Amino acid sequence: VIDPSELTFVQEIGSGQFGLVHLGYWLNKDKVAIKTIREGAMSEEDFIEEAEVMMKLSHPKLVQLYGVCLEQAPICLVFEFMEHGCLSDYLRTQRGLFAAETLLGMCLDVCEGMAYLEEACVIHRDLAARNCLVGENQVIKVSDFGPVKWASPEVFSFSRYSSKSDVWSFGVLMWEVFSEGKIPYENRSNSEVVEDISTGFRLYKPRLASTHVYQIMNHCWKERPEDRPAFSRLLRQLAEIAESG
């Protein structure tokens, strides 16, 4: 579903090389989020092959795409606009106004999206609050799909992603949620965090995280991938907890 320049570029809402992201409208009828490329930031094939798989993956917890603009000029990806910025950005401002029941709620949203990706054999080599979007009333969807603080050991040492690496990361995302946007291992070096984790240290339990929620974060933080719960398992454990405590 390719798009010719039927887009209106309103504002810039996030950069880095691999494109800028603009707030925009498609035919007016639709407030979209447009991610442009650059120039030599991605093979035409590299992005094409990427936009396809992204349009192949769909779940109510993954951010939706409207189509792509290859009809030239900085090539781009038209997403549906998520009305509340990224998660990390939402958790920080708005701190304190969350109910634990609401924070957990947010984790299940990302969990659901991840169980779907997991089953889709997709690995999110960068699952964090900063890559999560808040929209239609707290509803959280995971984007930027298709940072040693969020890395599992097999990523630290062997750059060995998997889907379990994700779970590990998810554990830290969960931490950011319950900490309400806090920087995990803030006062520490990447060549230092790797130290604390390897010895068995783990992110402390945030006040809003119940001991039961903390148990699951620590299950995502097991050293052995095969000792980590698959997202499909993670989703149900979080569903049970959510119902009560």
Q: Domains plus CATH for the chain? A: 1-83 (3.30.200.20), 84-245 (1.10.510.10)
C-alpha distances in angstroms, 213 versus 101, 226, 234? 11, 20, 11
Helix (H) or strand (E) holding 80: strand 76-80
The answer to whether the annotation marks 210 as part of a ligand binding site is no
Burial label for 76, CB within 10 Å (0-12, 13-18, 19+), is buried
Q: Catalytic residue positions?
A: 126
Residues 105, 86: Cα–Cα separation, whole Å: 16
The answer to whether the annotation marks 21 as part of a ligand binding site is yes
- Provide the experimental method for this PDB entry: X-ray
The answer to whether the annotation marks 15 as part of a ligand binding site is yes
CA 163 to chain centre: 13
Burial label for 16, CB within 10 Å (0-12, 13-18, 19+), is exposed
Write down the number of H helices and E strands in the chain.
Answer: 8, 7
19, 36 contact by CB (below 8 A): yes
The answer to whether the annotation marks 205 as part of a ligand binding site is no
User: Two tokens at 139?
Assistant: 């509803």
Burial label for 45, CB within 10 Å (0-12, 13-18, 19+), is exposed
Residues 189, 198: Cα–Cα separation, whole Å: 14
Helix (H) or strand (E) holding 170: helix 164-178
242, 200 contact by CB (below 8 A): no
Nearest CA to 238 among 102, 100, 111? 111
220, 167 contact by CB (below 8 A): yes
20, 72 contact by CB (below 8 A): no
Residues 245, 231: Cα–Cα separation, whole Å: 20
